[PDB]
Design a protein around this ligand. Structure first.
Ligand code: HEM
Length: 293
């Protein structure tokens, strides 16, 4: 409702063009493997895709992935986005090689490419985000706090038009990467396989022995002897009986998690965008592995 953003295909471009951009991102992911103590850039690219999309407000269609507004300093410097500059830096050479792609298309495609190259589910992706000017940049404060409970999380995500299943599925991306004390006031990875996309987050929530501890920034987080952590908002998925049932489902069905994540992540990346009836169908990009590259 209200403000309309219509997808407009980059002039003359088709699937092959975007597969080339995919491929450049995927090749750089392989090449720059030392980043973040050899975690690689996969996780921060997923997080960049989510934070550039996750500013959306369903009530008035402000924020969202369409405008590519993270490139403007208000949004780049959001405290909630601390760390994502690494993601943007990664994508700079990609954008220089492919200057025709929009910023919103690039940031969201970065996330799809990362998930797929990390052996996650295919994520259909649509082009046609259009850069919007600096004054369309959403204010800071629209991304979620980590110190809260399930009621917060549920209410938060209603603003992004996500239901309980979509919320728990999306949170499964916390298998990836880690919290960094200097970025967010939390420290530690959530699991062992943190640059391969799996349902480890749910298994760890249910099977590790968690202890509520204070980290060196004086914030509480849940820690396990194995060296893993969960944010208070992560742990809230097993405190709330409705979330817990879904966590159990995904812990017991890798394919179901893959399919529900793919749907929710595409939705997250497309919230706010109107696709014309005659727009191209969503693209499903081949991985490098599938291409023999
Ligand atoms: C209640 C919702 C969430 C909160 C409070 C939240 C909080 C966080 C925090 C505090 C960090 C660590 C940032 C850092 O110290 O570098 C993090 C990392 C991350 N988050 Fe979220 N998150 C949530 C939702 C999501 C969702 C929906 C996704 C994507 C689907 C996502 C993907 C990730 C990823 C991939 C990383 C690791 C990034 C890295 O390793 O560089 N998160 N998250």
């Amino acid at each position: 409702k209200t403000l309309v953003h219509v997808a407009s295909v980059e002039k003359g471009r088709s699937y092959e063009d975007f597969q080339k951009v995919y491929n450049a991102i995927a090749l750089k992911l392989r090449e720059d493997d030392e980043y973040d103590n050899y975690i690689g850039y996969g996780p921060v690219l997923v997080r960049l895709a989510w934070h550039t999309s996750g500013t959306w407000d369903k009530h008035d269609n402000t924020g969202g992935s369409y405008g590519g507004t993270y490139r403007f300093k208000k949004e780049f410097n959001d405290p909630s986005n601390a760390g994502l500059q690494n993601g943007f830096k990664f994508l700079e050479p990609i954008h220089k090689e492919f200057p025709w792609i929009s910023s919103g298309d690039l940031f969201s495609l970065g996330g799809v490419t990362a998930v797929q190259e990390m052996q996650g589910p295919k994520i259909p992706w649509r082009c046609g985000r259009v850069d919007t000017p600096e004054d369309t940049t959403p204010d800071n404060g629209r991304l979620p706090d980590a110190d809260k409970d399930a009621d917060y999380v549920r209410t938060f995500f209603q603003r992004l038009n996500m239901n309980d299943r979509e919320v728990v599925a999306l949170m499964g991306a916390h298998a990836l990467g880690k919290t960094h004390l200097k970025n967010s006031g939390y420290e530690g990875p959530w699991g062992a396989a943190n640059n391969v996309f799996t349902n480890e987050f749910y298994l760890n929530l249910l099977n590790e022995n968690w202890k509520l501890e204070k980290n060196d920034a004086n914030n509480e987080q849940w820690d396990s002897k194995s060296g893993y952590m969960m944010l208070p908002t992560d742990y809230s998925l097993i405190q709330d009986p409705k979330y817990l049932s879904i966590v159990k489902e995904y812990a017991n069905d890798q394919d179901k998690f893959f399919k529900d994540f793919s749907k929710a992540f595409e939705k997250l990346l497309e919230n706010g965008i109107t696709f014309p009836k005659d727009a191209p169908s969503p693209f499903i990009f081949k991985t490098l592995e599938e291409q023999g590259l």
